[PDB]
Design a protein around this ligand. Structure first.
Ligand code: 86Q
Length: 269
C-alpha cells in the first residue's frame, strides 16, 4: 500500500519533540489548512531487504492497518500517512499530557479501568498490542485525566487464536510465553496489565533484575512477591487481581472480560 507522497512540510509545521522509539521520532505538528494539532511520528524505512536498520514496509503497513481499524477514546487515532525515501510519517492524534506514571487505589483503578476499556476494545477485535508498558500509556491532557494507549508497532491481528514469530517487547513487561518464544495471543497483554498494575500500586517492578537476562529469568520463573513494605496498605482484592494475571499458563490467566468482572474492578538482548 502506498502513502501520500507530497512533502509533509507543505501541509504541516512541526514543533516540540514528544518522544521516540528505536527507529522513530515523534514531533508536535500543526496542519496548515485547519490549524489543528497532531503528533507526527517519523518512522525510519529500511534501505535494503537485508538491512537490520529501519522498520520493514511489512511491519509499518501492519501498524498502519491496525491503527486505521480502531476508534475508541482510550486508543490513539491515526489521521493521515505520508512517506518519502527515508521515512513513513504517521500523522496521529496529539496526546500532550505525557506518560501516566510521570503524572491511592481509587486513583490507580480510575486509570486502570480506562486501560482495561481500551484493551477490551482491542481484544474484541482480536488485536493484541504486544507492547503494553507504562511508557505506552499516555495522558491526553494532564491538566483536565484520560488515557490513550499508544505505539502499535508490535500489534497483530490474531485470527487463529495465536501468532508464532518471535515478537518481543521490553523484558520487564513481557509474558513468559514471549520469553520462551512460544505461540502468543491476547493473553500476553493481560500479563502485561498485571505488571502495570503492580507498579501502579507500589512504584516497584515485580520481575526487574540487575540485567536483562535476570529480568527474563524472573519472568519465566514467575519470580515475584508482594513486598510487605510496598503493599502493607494495599487491599487483598487488589493483590488478588494482580495474582490472577501474573500466571505462567496463558490458559489460566484472567482474560480482559474476566478482569472487568473481577470484584476489585466491577462496580531482549
Ligand atoms: N514510540 C512512540 C512514542 C510516542 C508516540 N508514539 N510512538 C506518540 C504518539 C502520539 C502522541 C504522542 C506520542 C509520544 C511518544
Amino acid at each position: 500500500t502506498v502513502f501520500r507522497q507530497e512533502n509533509v512540510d507543505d501541509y504541516y509545521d512541526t514543533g516540540e519533540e514528544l518522544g521516540s522509539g528505536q527507529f522513530a521520532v515523534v514531533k508536535k505538528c500543526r496542519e496548515k489548512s485547519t490549524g489543528l494539532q497532531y503528533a507526527a511520528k517519523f518512522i525510519k524505512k529500511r534501505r535494503t531487504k537485508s538491512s537490520r536498520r529501519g522498520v520493514s514496509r511489512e511491519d509499518i503497513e501492519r501498524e498502519v492497518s491496525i491503527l486505521k481499524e480502531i476508534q475508541h477514546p482510550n486508543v490513539i487515532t491515526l489521521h493521515e500517512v505520508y512517506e518519502n525515501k527515508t521515512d513513513v510519517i504517521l500523522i496521529l492524534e496529539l496526546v500532550a499530557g505525557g506518560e501516566l506514571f510521570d503524572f491511592t487505589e481509587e486513583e490507580a483503578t480510575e486509570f486502570l479501568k480506562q486501560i482495561l476499556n481500551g484493551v477490551y476494545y482491542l481484544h474484541s477485535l482480536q488485536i493484541a498490542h504486544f507492547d503494553l508498558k507504562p511508557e505506552n500509556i499516555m495522558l491526553l491532557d494532564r491538566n483536565v485525566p484520560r488515557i490513550k494507549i499508544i505505539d502499535f508497532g508490535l500489534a497483530h491481528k490474531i485470527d487463529f487464536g495465536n501468532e508464532f514469530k518471535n515478537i518481543f517487547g521490553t523484558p520487564e513487561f513481557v509474558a513468559p510465553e514471549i520469553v520462551n518464544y512460544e505461540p502468543l495471543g491476547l493473553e500476553a497483554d493481560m500479563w502485561s496489565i498485571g505488571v502495570i498494575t503492580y507498579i501502579l500500586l507500589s512504584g516497584a517492578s515485580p520481575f526487574l533484575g540487575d540485567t536483562k537476562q535476570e529480568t527474563l529469568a524472573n519472568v519465566s520463573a514467575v519470580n515475584y512477591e508482594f513486598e510487605d513494605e510496598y503493599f502493607s496498605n494495599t487491599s487483598a482484592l487488589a493483590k488478588d487481581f494482580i495474582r490472577r494475571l501474573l500466571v505462567k499458563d496463558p490458559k489460566k490467566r484472567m482474560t480482559i472480560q474476566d478482569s472487568l468482572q473481577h470484584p476489585w474492578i466491577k462496580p531482549q538482548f
